Design a protein around this ligand. Structure first.
Ligand SMILES: [Mn+2]
Ligand SMILES: [Mn+2]
Lengths: 199, 199
């Protein structure tokens, strides 16, 4: 098998006015498209080096694998974390865990926003689930480094703070992007990942 | 493919008094043995992950692959860079290149000493050849990060500054270890690696 660019589950303009059609179309059809292709290229190179036992080449491929592989993991999740049917607050057991672990829904939003704005350079903000501790956890990740691969936390909600995700519309004012994106969060999807975490 | 621990080109005591037999035995039969075994286990997990397209697992395995993979690369080179017949100064084209790029042999030693002593924590000092620039270059690497895999430079001479390489004999006094190791440098091996770069 090879990786494929997943279609967006909605129209490019479905998230307006919070994220405009130009960003969505570029962020999916150009950026993510490149990560999948580069990911498949790196995996093939990594396969040849492994068959040859060329460990030097394997390690030299690690930055491309983490960046483009992480890109595929993160963005594929990101599209499902957003929806025109999104916004508002989650329900049921996820809403209860958020209040228990962060005090309230608004406190959680403040913490994830602060983590996302606090990224200096490129990276991501994540809400995750800690299997060992059995509760939610917020983390920030540099560049395309994916949450679970580098921290073991299971991703529930990611916020792409790469400049290409918002600069066209919001320019340098990243907090304006963070303010707007809460209105299109697909809490239905995020709830599925949370419920999938417990057994 | 199954990597294997290469036999040492000499007995564990052949580098005394500069590196004592206990260090050599532990550094080869324990530390390096673990890198090969851990490298093989990590490589086997990669084959499964690649076959499954599990990119998260590939990225999670990267720290173990670089540390143990790099360990295998570096230590395998390190042993050949040392010899009971070593020490003194190189000759021929290697010596002529060292004088040109670093001013003199003694000046070269000061620069490689300073790079090796300057490593805070675990890492390596390397003399390398820059193929693109066509000259020698000194660099430091953190942990077991290998020179070529992370910098593209071809390794000519490596100095292990992990504490397990000198602490038993020299304790915290790494500069005494660095001074002593010059007595067992296998310049014949370093010359072969250098001449191989100008094919
Ligand atoms: Mn992005
Ligand atoms: Mn070592």
């Amino acid at each position: 098998m090879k990786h494929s660019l997943p279609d967006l589950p909605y129209d490019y303009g479905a998230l307006e006015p919070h994220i405009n059609a130009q960003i969505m179309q570029l962020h999916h059809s150009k950026h993510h498209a490149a990560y999948v292709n580069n990911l498949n290229v790196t995996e093939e190179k990594y396969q040849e080096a492994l068959a040859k036992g060329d460990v030097t080449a394997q390690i030299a491929l690690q930055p491309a694998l983490k960046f483009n592989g992480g890109g595929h993991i993160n963005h594929s999740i990101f599209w499902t974390n957003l929806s025109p049917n999104g916004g508002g607050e989650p329900k049921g057991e996820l809403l209860e865990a958020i209040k228990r672990d962060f005090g309230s829904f608004d406190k959680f939003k403040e913490k994830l926003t602060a983590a996302s704005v606090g990224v200096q350079g490129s990276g991501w903000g994540w809400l995750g689930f800690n299997k060992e501790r059995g509760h939610l956890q917020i983390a920030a990740c540099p560049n395309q480094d994916p949450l679970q691969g580098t921290t073991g936390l299971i991703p529930l909600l990611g916020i792409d703070v790469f400049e290409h995700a918002y600069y066209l519309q919001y320019k340098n004012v990243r907090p304006d992007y963070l303010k707007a994106i809460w209105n299109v969060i697909n809490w239905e999807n995020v709830t599925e990942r949370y419920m999938a975490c417990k057994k």
